[PDB]
Amino acid sequence: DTTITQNQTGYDNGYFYSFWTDAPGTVSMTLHSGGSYSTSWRNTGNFVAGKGWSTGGRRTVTYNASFNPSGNAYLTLYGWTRNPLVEYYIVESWGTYRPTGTYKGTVTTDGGTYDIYETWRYNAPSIEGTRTFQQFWSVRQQKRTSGTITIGNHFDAWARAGMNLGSHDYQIMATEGYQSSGSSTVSISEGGNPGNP
Numbered sequence: 001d002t003t004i005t006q007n008q009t010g011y012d013n014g015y016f017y018s019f020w021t022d023a024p025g026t027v028s029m030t031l032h033s034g035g036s037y038s039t040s041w042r043n044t045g046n047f048v049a050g051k052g053w054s055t056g057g058r059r060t061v062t063y064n065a066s067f068n069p070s071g072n073a074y075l076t077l078y079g080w081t082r083n084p085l086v087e088y089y090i091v092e093s094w095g096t097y098r099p100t101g102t103y104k105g106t107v108t109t110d111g112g113t114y115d116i117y118e119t120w121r122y123n124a125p126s127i128e129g130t131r132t133f134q135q136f137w138s139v140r141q142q143k144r145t146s147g148t149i150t151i152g153n154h155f156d157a158w159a160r161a162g163m164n165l166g167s168h169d170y171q172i173m174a175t176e177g178y179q180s181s182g183s184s185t186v187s188i189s190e191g192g193n194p195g196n197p
């Protein structure tokens with residue numbers, strides 16, 4: 001169970017977790033105690049895995065990680081909303097490719113500045129099957145592998161840029177790779193012990 005290699009989601013030690021890949025046998029996720037997990041991949045297709053919550057919110061999250069990408073990969077707060085269907089990213093670090101596209105401005109929060117981009121993803125896998133949907137991006141100007149993310153400040157920034165979110169679905173601190181190799185170990189948590197709304 002702890003070593004996931006098949007599409008799967010669930011709960012581990014209180015944290016929701018999700019694993020998805022279109023390339024079987026090229027990547028695995030290992031769930032550890034608390035809010036920790038690891039990933040290892042090699043010449044994979046595409047995958048997204050991480051721990052977090054099944055219902056996103058304006059959470060203030062703290063994480064620490066070892067991110068060792070060998071090519072295209074992301075260390076990012078990742079999530080989905082419905083109606084409208086939106087896949088969003090708060091990118092903390094990346095490999096060889098830095099997310100880009102239509103510049104919507106910037107947002108300063110948690111000791112750093114992030115560039116804001118909005119792009120489209122065509123006929124791609126989603127929490128609602130094969131769909132075309134928009135992607136909201138907050139990309140830090142300085143890569144980092146630990147710190148705090150006041151998610152609320154990003155949502156506000158996106159909103160002020162005409163990027164409207166829908167009804168929140170899952171929200172996780174994820175590792176995503178694309179036709180690359182690498183590994184990661186990520187530890188995340190929320191401030192205090194408020195529970196889930």
Ligand SMILES: *[C@@H]1O[C@H](CO)[C@@H](O[C@@H]2O[C@H](CO)[C@@H](O[C@@H]3O[C@H](CO[C@H]4O[C@H](CO)[C@@H](O)[C@H](O)[C@@H]4O)[C@@H](O)[C@H](O)[C@@H]3O)[C@H](O)[C@H]2NC(C)=O)[C@H](O)[C@H]1NC(C)=O
Pocket residue numbers: 005006007020021022023024025123124125130
């Ligand atoms: C988890 O569920 C995923 C679905 O969300 C599974 O993804 C599928 O993974 C298989 C490989 O096991 C891919 O099969 C290949 O398909 C390509 C053609 O791809 C194009 O057409 C499909 C049509 O559905 C489209 O989805 C793609 O985006 C491409 O446009 C062939 O050339 C290969 O020979 C091979 O058949 C599927 O493409 C892929 N589908 C999706 C939705 O991405 C995934 O397998 C599951 N993971 C595990 C570990 O089982």
